[PDB]
Amino acid sequence: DIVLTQSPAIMSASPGEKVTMTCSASSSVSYMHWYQQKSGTSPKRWIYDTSKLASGVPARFSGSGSGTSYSLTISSMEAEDAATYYCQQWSSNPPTFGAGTKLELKRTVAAPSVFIFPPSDEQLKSGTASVVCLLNNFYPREAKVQWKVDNALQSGNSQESVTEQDSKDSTYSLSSTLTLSKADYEKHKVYACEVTHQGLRSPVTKSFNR
Amino acid sequence: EVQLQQSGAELAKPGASVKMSCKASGYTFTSYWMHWVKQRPGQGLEWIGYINPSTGYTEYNQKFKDKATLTADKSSSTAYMQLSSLTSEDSAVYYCAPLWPLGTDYWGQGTTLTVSSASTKGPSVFPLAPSGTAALGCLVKDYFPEPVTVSWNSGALTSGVHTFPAVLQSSGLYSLSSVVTVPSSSLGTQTYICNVNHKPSNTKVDKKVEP
């Protein structure tokens, strides 16, 4: 019943930098263990008994701590070290895990390539309209996509989805989907996707007419 | 050498029961306890319990005392967990792992449990038609449960492909897009087809995307 609070919840690091994340236990703990989880795989043992590295773990990793504060450190951050890191204790049963600290890779800004797609005629046959706006290979993840139909700023009728950081060029992609009924779709004429992002000096607008 | 082959993903009704397995290879099954941990997105990891496959002794997290039941079969080197009285909270990924004693750093790949009264539903697949680099893609709409698998031109189109995470619609059904970036010169020459595969509905569909 020891609650492990990992700080920070999200962090990024340039390759070369030293990385440090903490794990704060609500009560005293004798030893802390660390697991590493990469996207779409199961966790793997990384550090046991506070300081001792598991088999296969590069020497750049190291673990310290006592009492209520334990730490995971990477002296020279590398690309392959991007993952989620969980801390765990056995000292008091039940065993408890941390909420995780996500380690992402830093990179220079990159501007998105924007695409807009009108809904297919097969979809309109079904009576619904999905307008998709694609932002490709940008950094950082923070990007603002706004829909505007006949200069009317849409709100509450769109969903975004973001890819995981690209292992090669560390960029993201995003798809915003504007969902309308076929009736509402055909009421208006011009459909616009207005992207704001640090890699753009000015907002990029892709549009089409119905 | 050590592999922990867990059962396939399951869909279960509320109040029903489910039994998932965890097959051990490459190490002595009885020498290491088999623990079970739960991963919900956002919450983190929760420890369910362990079994000693030699003696059959079990302990449970008090949170899961009545939910989980751990068993093991020495003959097949396989560990079991059974969830009962299912709620939507029991929808999660359940891992199987010999965390004690030390020396088997591997976990099972994870069984994904979905608790819903709803029936399965196959995806509808619409094209995202393009029009020196043009984007095109597939819209995979209105399926349940997860997951969906998207490949392109049977597999020979891997570079530039972005299959997005599923996003939950207000309809209660998942939706995702798969996109590819390609030279626009090759548009009339190359034919682009996305291969959508929804296993829980035993649905395969191939959709040709053209300008």
Residue numbers in the entry:
A (entry chain B): 1 to 210
B (entry chain A): 1 to 131, 138 to 217
What did the publication describing this PDB structure actually write?
Here, we have determined the crystal structure of the antigen binding fragment (Fab) of anti-SCH antibody JoJ48C11, both in the apo form and in complex with the oligosaccharide laminarihexaose. The JoJ48C11 Fab fragment adopts the expected heterodimeric structure of a heavy chain fragment and a light chain both consisting of a constant (C) and a variable (V) immunoglobulin (Ig) domain.
For this, we produced recombinant Fab fragments of JoJ48C11 by adding human constant CH1 and Ckappa domains to the respective variable regions of the initial JoJ48C11 scFv fragment and crystallized the purified protein to collect diffraction data. The resulting structure was refined to 3.0 Å resolution. Not surprisingly, backbone atoms can easily be superposed onto other Fab structures, and even several structures with almost identical CL, CH and VL domains including their CDRs can be found. However, with respect to previously published Fab fragments, the VH domain of JoJ48C11 Fab is slightly different, especially in the CDR3 region. To further refine insight into the JoJ48C11 Fab/SCH interaction, we used SwissDock to generate models of a complex with the repeating unit (RU) of SCH and the apo structure of JoJ48C11 Fab. Subsequent mutagenesis studies proved His35H, Trp47H, Trp100H and Trp90L to be necessary for binding SCH, since their respective alanine mutants showed significant decrease of binding strength with EC50 values of 1.1 nM to 10.9 nM, which are higher than 0.6 nM (3 times the EC50 value of wild type JoJ48C11 scFv-Fc). Interestingly, in order to avoid clashes with SCH, Trp100H has to adopt a different sidechain rotamer than is observed the apo structure. Here, we discovered via protein crystallography and in silico docking that the paratope structure of JoJ48C11 consists of two cavity-shaped binding sites that are connected by a shallow groove.
